[PDB]
Amino acid sequence: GHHHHHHLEGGGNAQKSAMARAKNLEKAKAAGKGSQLEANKKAMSIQCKVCMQTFICTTSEVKCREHAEAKHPKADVVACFPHLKK
Template sequence: MGGGNGAKSQQARERNAAKAGKGPSSQLKSNAAAMSIQCNICKQAFQSTAKKPMLDQHVDSKHSKQGFAACFPNYTA
């Protein structure tokens, strides 16, 4: 015979218990590890996926006198 509501509820409880055993699913640690671009002047970190326009915005707002090369000398496009 078919599974009633009781069987479905039991399966849902088992699924949720299995998910709870896996631990937190936060990406905070992986995001922190991806912060590989750093401004040489103020030491602010950026993710490795940061594009040049985002870094240009940082230079314009924080270090307009020093320029892009002074902030990010190792940056390659």
Template sequence: MGNGAKAQQKRERNQKDGKAAKSQLKVNQQACDIQCVVCKSTFLKTTKAPALTEHAENKHNKTLSEAFPSFEE
């Protein structure tokens, strides 16, 4: 039996248990609270200041407060 057959059997077993694969995409989309005012890119609300500063400096040559005026640490 190859790995493909094992994977299929596992999927069938899990299907019988009522467990379905759940996607996190919708939850992640709703959690994008921080938005860059220059390019309108959204970031998760758990994004830290260094990552936002890097975006502002590398993409727009601006400071954190210029690109994300509503951001609070």
């Protein structure tokens, strides 16, 4: 031994993994957050106006721009990103 017992066992993930197999695989989150069959949204798509959250870039801003001028009801559902309204 000269730093730790082993280096990459392959897998495991258990309560007793916290130090022994910490470098093996912890991932980060035990499940995730969402995004299944979805596209890559780790690109930092759209931040929500309410604070700092995010929404999927299924629309850029220019395409919502045309939709905005043509609509702009009251934002509401798009109040989270008012480029989709006027």
